[PDB]
Symmetry: C3
Subunit: 184 residues, 3 copies
């Protein structure tokens, strides 16, 4: 079974215009969290182990040659694109969970927004691996042999962003279904 995703804050997304000042067809956006998540029939949620790597793959289909972001101020020229990901707390959606990336020496760095090049008329595959939640979910412990009625969850947010004129604008974002993160 596979982690499901849904559009996150679609009414907040900026759009893209090309060099002819024509709006681009909406870009195709697909998020796939391949390794790292297992569905627990008894918990009715995806589970992972904080110790294990998980990986996220994003396919971004750029349908034309973008040059501007349309903003409140209007059309501003594109500086670059960023992929951003973070957890949020299902019972406190305004609270983020850092994601971390373990390096080849098993150190960990907090995962910062990464620059992506999105050539026109192409789908670009972006794979981010060796990821970890910086946190476990609260109340994982079973109570009365049944799931803790105060079981807490995270959700994953994967967003594509455009930097233009010293602000950021979301182009596309998806949020996952709830996840339990357990210790060992």
């Amino acid at each position: 079974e596979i982690i499901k995703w849904q559009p996150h804050q679609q009414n907040k997304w900026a759009t893209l215009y090309d060099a002819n000042y024509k709006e681009l067809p909406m870009l195709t956006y697909r998020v796939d969290a391949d390794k790292g998540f297992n569905f627990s029939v008894g918990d009715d949620a995806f589970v992972c182990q904080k110790k294990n790597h998980f990986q996220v793959t994003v396919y971004i289909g750029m349908l034309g040659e973008p040059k501007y972001v349309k903003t409140p101020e209007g059309l501003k020229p594109l500086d670059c694109f960023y992929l951003k990901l973070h957890g949020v707390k299902l019972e406190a959606l305004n609270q983020s969970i850092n994601i971390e990336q373990s390096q080849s020496d098993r150190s960990k760095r907090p995962f910062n927004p990464v620059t992506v090049n999105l050539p026109p008329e192409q789908v670009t595959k972006v794979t981010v691996g060796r990821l970890h939640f910086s946190e476990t979910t609260a109340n994982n412990m079973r109570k009365k042999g049944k799931p803790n009625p105060d079981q807490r969850y995270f959700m994953l947010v994967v967003a594509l962003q455009a930097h233009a004129q010293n602000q950021n604008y979301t182009l596309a974002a998806q949020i996952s279904e709830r996840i339990i993160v357990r210790a060992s």
Copy 2:
């Protein structure tokens, strides 16, 4: 295999504004019909038995503190939220099928819109169980050993609604793929 859902009448949905008169980021909305449905490879559709309970779970992520619905008349204050569900006939989409909920004494009541409290910055899980279709689908009977070419279907509609100034406004709705409902 799992029942798939899609946005239902997205161009008819009202939006929510907070106390600062700012529009809320679109709320996250996920519908899961857990128990009650089985996929029939030969019928190429989900099947259930009218006798069996089915259950629906809705996760509603409220991203901010809602206070107003934006309406044709403009911003009106929120009275409450309702979850509404009903079947429709795939060959007559303007025709509803009542859903019923069997009580703890095996009586059945028609399932009325239920009040839901949606605290801000939280995902609220709403589970509606012990549900039944008030009807079977027509033409379930096999003809020539093949599926009845007049096989009929229902689809499930699960909608989140806001009551404000003595009218109702849809905030989010999803409709399922087709379902066959059989007798025993």
Copy 3:
């Protein structure tokens, strides 16, 4: 495992108005590619054989009685509806792959847009079978026992279109996830 679909160019779609000049609720649209596709764990993509038939089913739920398309010029009367499908190249999204339909004598015709009748208040099921890609994907060959790092892919585009006043307008479209097409 099942081919996943996503809305394609949603900001380019026209809407429908009825005889009372009221906009129709957005039509329900679901695309299912049943036979013809198999998921390859090692390639992390759906695969098919160019020799094999694949089939596509579309469920179109018409919610009211459409009479006009809303266009740049404004409301124009509906002539008919067309289903259109084609591949595109994932590394060149502006490049189509013809789909072909093999006839009952194993000839093949290029698959042209097909007229569909969409009666009001009904879901219409449209099944298009005996389909083939006119092409294989480039670089299918394994390199160093690992997938070719230049592996190419198609995506399927299935679109519902309205003909009005000698132009076409897209009402709904979905695009699949990437596909490898192999020879025998």
